[PDB]
């Protein structure tokens, strides 16, 4: 039906922000999703400036694989970057979204993901690409899928503010108000 209320676990997930931040914002997203591209460019930076920078919010991203083989490739790459060079993760993440074209045909390839690793992280392109071929990080993508299913994710992006499901990811008023209400409660 709809995404389930409740606090998703961010254990093992990429995180940005202070450990002790009182509000956790989680995005369930897909690198091939055009609405996730919009969230990344239009909404995410506002949450950063307003909340993450000042230690109010810690942010996490969980992979959802709604757009076929390219979604899976992208997710495997994302997992590897978090594990091997987490300090660079959010730079790689933002560039993969910036790379998403405004066309519907498959665009995700190992060469593409290898080039991003080279520009944004300390990870070797050939290493990343070898791991994509072997699907070295498949267990982490499956863990993400398990979590997606547990929360009954129906569309991407789905944003959680603590245990609250945001109705419209593109409505910064809703997001900001919900963050602020959770801060109060805290």
Curated annotation (Swiss-Prot):
Subcellular location: Cell membrane; Membrane raft
Top-rank taxon: Bacteria
Keyword NAD: no
GO cellular component: membrane raft; plasma membrane
Protein name: Disulfide bond formation protein D
Key words of the record: Cell membrane, Competence, Disulfide bond, Membrane, Oxidoreductase, Redox-active center, Signal
Gene Ontology biological process terms, A to Z: establishment of competence for transformation
Portion of the parent chain present: 37 to 222 of 222
Cysteines engaged in disulfide bonds, as pairs: 33-36
Stretches assigned to coiled coil: none
Primary location recorded for the protein, binned into one broad class: membrane
Function: Required for the stabilization, possibly via formation of a disulfide bond, of the obligatory competence protein ComGC. May be required for the stability of secreted proteins with disulfide bonds. Not required for sporulation.
Domain Thioredoxin: 1-184
Summary of the knockout phenotype: Cells partially restore cytochrome c oxidase activity in a CcdA-deficient mutant, possibly because the bacteria can no longer oxidize the 2 heme-binding thiol groups in apocytochrome c.
UniProt family annotation: Belongs to the thioredoxin family. DsbA subfamily.
GO molecular function: oxidoreductase activity
